[PDB]
Design a protein around this ligand. Structure first.
Ligand code: HEM
Length: 154
């Protein structure tokens, strides 16, 4: 499950493009997640009333949430697998307060990949997409192990 340095640089080089406008990327990723897997929207008490993509795009609070979420993910990715400290708080909140199954982490990973594939073909060819998938699989593996330590089946 361990990534090479080369693989991490493919991850970080596409992430550098996300960081030109993290808010806009976050909006596109949430819209993709909620349209592909509508059940995931039901986990968001503050956003579950949004009915359409237009409402999602107009939500300033959802935009701010996407910035928080992608910035936390980016800090994980920049650790290049040495992310134990970052995963502790995230696993605890997601297991115990939000109750987010591993299957829903797989869905958001799919939405991230889809949006990078569409926006960033210059830095998201097949090898770069493979490296990003490996990094998100590692994240999900390590979160699942923490979930189990915390008492949550995931
Ligand atoms: C890449 C994966 C994800 C990352 C990095 C991430 C990160 C975060 C962060 C940093 C927060 C705020 C602090 C906290 O409560 O822990 C948060 C809140 C939250 N997350 Fe996630 N998250 C991820 C995936 C998901 C998914 C897939 C769902 C639901 C389907 C979800 C549901 C929530 C909810 C319900 C909150 C509270 C939102 C609010 O305050 O209105 N998360 N997430």
């Amino acid at each position: 499950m361990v990534l090479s340095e080369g693989e991490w640089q493919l991850v970080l080089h596409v992430w550098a493009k996300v960081e030109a406008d993290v808010a806009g990327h976050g909006q596109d990723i949430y819209i993709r997640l909620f349209k592909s897997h509508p059940e995931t929207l039901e986990k968001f008490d503050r956003f579950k009333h949004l009915k359409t993509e237009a409402e999602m795009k107009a939500s300033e609070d959802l935009k701010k949430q996407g910035v928080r979420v992608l910035t936390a993910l980016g800090a994980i990715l920049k650790k290049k697998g040495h992310h134990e400290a970052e995963l502790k708080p995230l696993a605890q909140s997601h297991a115990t307060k939000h109750k987010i199954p591993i299957k829903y982490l797989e869905f958001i990973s799919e939405a991230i990949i889809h949006v990078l594939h569409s926006r960033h073909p210059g830095n998201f060819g097949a090898d770069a997409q493979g490296a990003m998938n490996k990094a998100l699989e590692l994240f999900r593996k390590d979160i699942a192990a923490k979930y189990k330590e915390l008492g949550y089946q995931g």
